[PDB]
Write a protein that binds this ligand. Structure first.
Ligand code: OMP
Ligand code: OMP
Lengths: 256, 256
């Protein structure tokens, strides 16, 4: 198993994955903040304060009440300052012809500011083809959703294998997966795992939690995605540091 | 097999389905326009001119370059005038806690103006639970994506059966499906079928077309969803009338 720094140099590494892996090793962070807030001011204050602790800030631009492209300009300034990637968790899941417009256009212009986006594989590989026609020219990357954290997920067995094949056949654009575990044996591919909290439990709408030690250490994933475990805490900086130290030590102990 | 007018009166019918089925029978239309345009002025001019020919106008609010909630106010005025439902084809596909915010909030406030939305079933039933916590109080309905028109679709076999079970277990909110065919044997549930053109063919990004006669007449669906077959035509009114007459006659001939 290679360190994040060595994976950043693999011959077939995507430039976006390389940039991410480099700053993960430099900053000793494999934490992605899920900035699940409705106010631009809270999004930007979290990005600034937690920026040093995170490798990535995950957005849902479509729950932000006061979205403007200028908010995203301010977010990019913080991402550059503190060295993290921006991941818009849009979960593209339509035919190729539709997702290309949803990615490039409309009010959000996601491709203009998001380093990473993700897509469901259920529509077939046209979803990736459509996104890549916008994303390749704009030097972006994509994650495929191979497994989900929610109760009753149908992303199991042959579905997960199809996601891995689709990623591996589109390595020019696909840099990894949303998954609960290592699903690809190819080290050029990032594994990002949501459904993470230090304590056992869930929410009232099908979310299920596992710990950083379980998903990084035992299940072999690279990055934890954490929302409420940080966002709902009083001191979001100390919460982020707890999650960072947990995920980083779990990674180190798997390396040996 | 019951007429649309008789299905509108079924004991377990959802109010949104009833309203739709009534206006389908009144207007002799089972055509849903896929208004896949980037300009509000074009969206509204299509809605006004084609309103009499359609039972439903399907939107992708996130490809509209000049979206404002006022554009949707003008769309509702036309929907009321001409008697059609508004369907936002958002394809919600996240955990329940996330989709409730994506449906109610952000810039689009989809639940405030959309009669219908749709969701993927891959995350499990929490996607429906989350949407229904916004949609039930706002008297809205939802369609579940049981089959897809695109090449390589994984929405087959056990996946399609899971979508039908999920719909049937959430009949308070779920009024039907996006599908290629009749997938539910319960007549209270609408079947809407995209991937429709009069001529054989496809697009360059995995879209596959079947005719109105095939999907309404042979495959037993209720409503055709048509984008480019109308939108790319010079005379979009005559194109809409051709699709309406095709879908309506296919429906009548299945009734006998
Ligand atoms: O793509 C994702 O990040 C995602 C996939 C998944 O399987 N589960 C999952 O929870 N998510 C997202 O990750 C975040 C989880 O947030 P918390 O449950 O608050 O930690 C939410 O923004 C979800 O939309
Ligand atoms: O939910 C949908 O309407 C949808 C599902 C699907 O399986 N296939 C499909 O094409 N669609 C949508 O229906 C429309 C098809 O448009 P045309 O191919 O131009 O007729 C697009 O807006 C797609 O996003």
């Amino acid at each position: 198993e290679l360190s994040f720094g060595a994976r950043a140099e693999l011959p077939r590494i995507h430039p976006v994955a390389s940039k991410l892996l480099r700053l993960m090793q430099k900053k000793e962070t494999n934490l992605c903040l899920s900035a699940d807030v409705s106010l631009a001011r809270e999004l930007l204050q979290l990005a600034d304060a937690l920026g040093p602790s995170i490798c990535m800030l995950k957005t849902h631009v479509d729950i932000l009440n006061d979205f403007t492209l200028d908010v995203m300009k301010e977010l990019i300034t913080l991402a550059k300052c503190h060295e993290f990637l921006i991941f818009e968790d849009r979960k593209f899941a339509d035919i190729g012809n539709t997702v290309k417009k949803q990615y490039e256009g409309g009010i959000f212009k996601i491709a203009s500011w998001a380093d990473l986006v993700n897509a469901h594989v259920v529509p077939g590989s046209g979803v990736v083809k459509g996104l890549q026609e916008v994303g390749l020219p704009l030097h972006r990357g994509c994650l495929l959703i191979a497994e989900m954290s929610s109760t009753g997920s149908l992303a199991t067995g042959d579905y997960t294998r199809a996601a891995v094949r689709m990623a591996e056949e589109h390595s020019e654009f696909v840099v990894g997966f949303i998954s609960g575990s290592r699903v690809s044996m190819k080290p050029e591919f990032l594994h990002l795992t949501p459904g993470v909290q230090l304590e056992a439990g869930g929410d009232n709408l099908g979310q299920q939690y596992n710990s950083p030690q379980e998903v990084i250490g035992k299940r072999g994933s690279d990055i934890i995605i954490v929302g409420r475990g940080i966002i709902s805490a009083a001191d979001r900086l100390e919460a982020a540091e707890m999650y960072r130290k947990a995920a980083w030590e779990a990674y180190l102990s798997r390396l040996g």
